[PDB]
Design a protein around this ligand. Structure first.
Ligand SMILES: *C(=O)/C=C/NCC(=O)CCO
Ligand SMILES: *C(=O)/C=C\NCC(=O)CCO
Lengths: 260, 260
């Protein structure tokens, strides 16, 4: 009501396109803004890949311990963890943490390969009831975020529903659900995004994303002071290929939908 | 300099008092702004406490695995990790990680108690040649940040020199230095502060703080794309007791001093 008006006011001054999906698990209420429009996921896609590899680890005992070779030719555009291990190895646990907490694009490419390509991540999405998610490309081209391109996109509504099932639902075994939530809570990249819009007392696990067209994304599980968890997806994209990131817009969207 | 004009402009437009110390380890060059003025450290003091415990673990080789009791009465104002272990235990390693990466105030009180009180943190600072740093109080009163109050203060220059010795120098043993850097690089709270002012490709370990009078702090070790490491300290405080935190001022400061 006032929230829809305020989200429209924010978008109108933002210089881009804003998508919001909030799920309040206290009462299963939702706040949706362009929640059925497709947005480029960029690195928010890493949550689906890490979750798919967690699911694999329910049946392959010690999968997370399995060392994976990192070669110089594996490195892509953003490799803060992987570069230390070129001509060496990282475990699937280390690749999962590097992708989620550091947004390591080489780490994500090893998760994708472990799942049999982009289509294997999409198949996992389908298996947990997400019919909207699609991963089409590897890193780093999955972040081109070209307006109108359906590659590597989802909708705020579908991503909010998926994150709820992965982090609070029974899409994963209990140990795997706890590991995902532990990784998301240890994110290093999120303080300027959704978190920036919330009271300092609230606990957040999130995964950010960014790419071309100034695309600026965050998906978060939020444990508010004295309240049941929230799921929040904030996606934002701009019309110019070289636009700057707008994490402030995401913070503003989070303040609007949580202001009560 | 251009840099001096930019920092003076940032400070004046912020309404506050800004303290900046950059060390460039390529050539030991410095950028300095009010770098010898005292500022309330707030949670940036956690680095000295965690480093003091690391130093103790060089002679007490099992210390980081020691279980510490968390009682309900131990909980202070911000306990994101410790509240999960009330009526249980956490190891000194888990408490160091909680303090550094989550700014857990109950975890910091455990580190202070391990060192025999705020005096024990100050004694470690003096053992590594920091004659400026003082810790006077426990959490959460060490964050009051009252203008003119010398308690729980240091200077940007002294904290930058100290962070250099701890993370890049020989204040700690090689293992302990590596562990401190690993903890700082895994900080969850920093993406809106120094990091937000830097090129995305630069790797950062940092410790934020905030307290009374809108005090907003960050201390960081920076491995730039293709350059020798930097140490940067950005301290900020405001005249009004319940002023808003301003992490954007620290990001602006970081951009100004690194743009060259
Ligand atoms: C995913 O959204 C991005 C992953 N890493 C590439 C970067 O450059 C991260 C910093 O924006
Ligand atoms: C740190 O500066 C002061 C307290 N740390 C915990 C807190 O109260 C806010 C988040 O850092």
């Amino acid at each position: 009501a006032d929230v829809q008006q305020k989200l429209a006011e924010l978008e109108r001054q933002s210089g881009g396109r804003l998508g919001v999906a909030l799920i309040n698990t206290a009462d299963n209420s939702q706040i949706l803004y362009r929640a059925d429009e497709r947005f480029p996921m960029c690195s928010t896609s890493k949550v689906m890949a890490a979750a798919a590899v967690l699911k694999q680890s329910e049946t392959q005992k010690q999968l997370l311990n399995q060392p994976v070779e990192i070669k110089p030719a594996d490195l892509v555009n953003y490799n803060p963890i992987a570069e230390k291990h070129v001509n060496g190895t990282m475990t699937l646990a280390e690749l999962s943490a590097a992708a989620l907490q550091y947004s390591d694009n080489t780490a994500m490419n090893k998760l994708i390969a472990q799942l049999g390509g982009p289509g294997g991540v999409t198949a996992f999405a389908r298996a947990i009831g997400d019919e909207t998610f699609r991963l089409d490309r590897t890193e780093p081209t999955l972040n081109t975020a070209i307006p109108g391109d359906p590659r590597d996109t989802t909708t705020p509504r579908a991503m909010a529903q998926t994150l709820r099932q992965l982090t609070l639902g029974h899409a994963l075994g209990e140990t795997q659900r706890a590991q995902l939530v532990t990784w998301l809570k240890g994110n290093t990249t999120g303080a300027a995004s959704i978190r920036a819009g919330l009271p300092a007392s609230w606990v957040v696990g999130d995964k950010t994303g960014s790419g071309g067209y100034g695309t600026t994304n965050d998906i978060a599980v939020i444990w508010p002071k004295d309240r049941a968890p929230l799921i929040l997806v904030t996606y934002f994209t701009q019309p110019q290929p070289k636009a700057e990131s707008r994490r402030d817009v995401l913070a503003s969207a989070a303040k609007i939908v949580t202001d009560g």
